């Protein structure tokens, strides 16, 4: 059955991409060498441009992704080359360094050794490659709630976090064969961070708010032809929304729209007052605003969603079934002033994809 | 086949009625008194106290529908007796009138004479009872974009519009055996109007916005126990975001986004700087603000989600699946700051309940 499924994936994988790569002549000879191979070894390997193109179609069938207009630039580094945790280290370090590319983020993303067996060869822990920890204890929190489990599961190892609202979690991986994860702490040269400033409002800065500048999903795994990268952590830019209404503005993160709402100067007393959303699109204007003046890319949901229905316009233009998660694609801040909330979406799921995978702690 | 749907709709629905109205015991005769109904004349008639509890159950039932928590308190208007386009009339008059309530909106709904063999008694032509219309010729547009279909099939009874922005629309209605609708201007004193200030920026009333009090749905189908009731109308408040998020913001309706921006002082030229979020916020501020002050009933989003929240509680605790449809239940604006964004819904479809029923115009 296990080869079977590889099987059936891998034919439809390989026709796909030959027909897109324009190569549709040669389906037919490295189907055949990926039988036998798979007959023999148990497995296949992919060619780099398979597996490039397999990323980038991951990437373009991305059901939740309003980004995906740019599915076809995606910075592809193979990395199956990898056996030692310094090597990994070391290429998580490389994408952080590349991708960030001075603020001029680059999509990338960094293929580790698939799954062999269902076995991992490179367990990532992380859910982001850049990450605040959170702590939670004695009444107190600290951080990002959201790095709670993982934070503390870093301190199991050794690592011990300084307790700000702002501490970098350390890379945290398994490698096959080893019981623990190994943890390095990230040389904060590479980390670039945005202080978060408003435009108008000078008080604004009272409230030390900061965010990192490269959002890298390292945790999810990347299925191509029935091949398992478990480890193929991947970074666009941020869309502001995400750091405005999503991590410094949730109950359940960091929560500052109360505080907020006393920097600009309004009352947070009644629901009729919206001060909720009058904090948010302010909190929402000042991410974008130091940002750019950062240098350090990023977008709003405005322009998202105008370059996603260009996504469109080009996937029907290409005869290409459109797929897309309405609840994930509309921003969580005026979705009604964008096309998507006006249209619906197939939520289908057409692989090559990014899948979740169950957390190692 | 017919009749079958009917008798087995009718069998469910009066099974669940009489067990929450603790009448169980009463479920065996009355079913016999209507299945000999059915047999015999083909269909079957609601007592008063069925027709009441099936209307609201059919609002609790409503997936898209936030302001659930009251539909216990649906006031529920039987008007199966008419027969006359004057009753009709004078039955939506009173509707108007008696859900309006100077201002303190008492969620009602007027049930007219159901259908009988598919055939329908009474056909409103309305989308709501009050709304404006719309006119789009010569390259211009007056009025609400929405109505422009109704506006130019009233047009053709000989009803004419001002073609101010704010043309209330009159009723229009079919009567079983006439082949055309009938219309009856509103009289305005029965039409409570909002014009839409703003608490703090005096420039808002240059806008000369305003909105009706009452939105009033007339042209769902409410079933109840196989019995289509096509001619319902029905009205609860206004959620602000109605009016400020969709009926005046939306490009297609009223469009002020851009003449907000420019009233509260704010460029609308960049979409880094979030204008659109900007402007939505103050407006629905504003709406929020001017129905306050003109004592007509208004909810915020946030109240509304709260409520819903509680909905939700109650009916966990009445052992009662609640479903849901997320995607008309969060708000336009700032949905992730209600609970509603951060967790899922079973779409099901529950009746009694309230449906779409195809135009006639
Ligand atoms: C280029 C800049 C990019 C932007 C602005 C962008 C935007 C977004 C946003 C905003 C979401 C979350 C939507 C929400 O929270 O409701 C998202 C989800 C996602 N994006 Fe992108 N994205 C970009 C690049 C990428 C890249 C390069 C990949 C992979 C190669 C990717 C794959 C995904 C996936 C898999 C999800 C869903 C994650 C999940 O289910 O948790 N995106 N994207
Ligand atoms: C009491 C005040 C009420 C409030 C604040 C309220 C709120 C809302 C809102 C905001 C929506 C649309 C959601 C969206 O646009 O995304 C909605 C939909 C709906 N409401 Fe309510 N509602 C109320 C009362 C009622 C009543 C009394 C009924 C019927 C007896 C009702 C039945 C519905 C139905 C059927 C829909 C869906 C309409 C459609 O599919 O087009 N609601 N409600
Ligand atoms: C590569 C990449 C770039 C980018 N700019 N953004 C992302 C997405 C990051 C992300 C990761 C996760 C973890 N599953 C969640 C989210 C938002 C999650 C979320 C949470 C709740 C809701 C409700 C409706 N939509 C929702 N979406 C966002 C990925
Ligand atoms: C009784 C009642 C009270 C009240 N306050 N609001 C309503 C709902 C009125 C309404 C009617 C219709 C017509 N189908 C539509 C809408 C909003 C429609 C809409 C349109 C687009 C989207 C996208 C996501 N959700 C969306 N919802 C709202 C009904
Ligand atoms: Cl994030
Ligand atoms: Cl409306």
Known sequence: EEKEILWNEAKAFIAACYQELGKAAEVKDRLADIKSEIDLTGSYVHTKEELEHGAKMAWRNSNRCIGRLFWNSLNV?????????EEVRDALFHHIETATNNGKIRP????????????????????????????????????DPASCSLTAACEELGWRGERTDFDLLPLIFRM????????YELPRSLVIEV?????????????????????????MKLEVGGIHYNAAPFNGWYMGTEIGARNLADEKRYDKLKKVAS??????????????????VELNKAVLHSYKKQGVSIVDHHTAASQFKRFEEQAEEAGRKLTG??????????????????????NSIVKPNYFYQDKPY
């Open 77 to 85: 580094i193979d990395r199956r080359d990898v056996r030692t945790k």
């Open 176 to 183: 096959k064969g080893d019981e623990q994860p190994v943890w």
């Open 195 to 219: 202080p978060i400033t408003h435009p108008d409002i000078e008080a604004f800065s009272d409230l030390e708010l900061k965010w990192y500048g490269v959002p890298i999903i390292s945790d």
């Open 325 to 346: 998660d309405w609840t994930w694609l509309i921003p969580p801040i005026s979705p009604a002033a964008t096309h998507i909330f006006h249209r619906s979406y197939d």
């Open 263 to 280: 920097v600009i100067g309004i009352a947070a007393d009644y629901n009729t007052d919206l001060w909720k959303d009058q904090a948010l």
């Open 108 to 143: 990338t993303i960094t293929i580790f050794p698939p799954e062999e067996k269902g076995e991992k060869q490179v367990e990532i822990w992380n859910h982001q490659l850049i990450r605040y920890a959170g702590y939670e204890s004695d009444g107190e929190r600290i951080g």
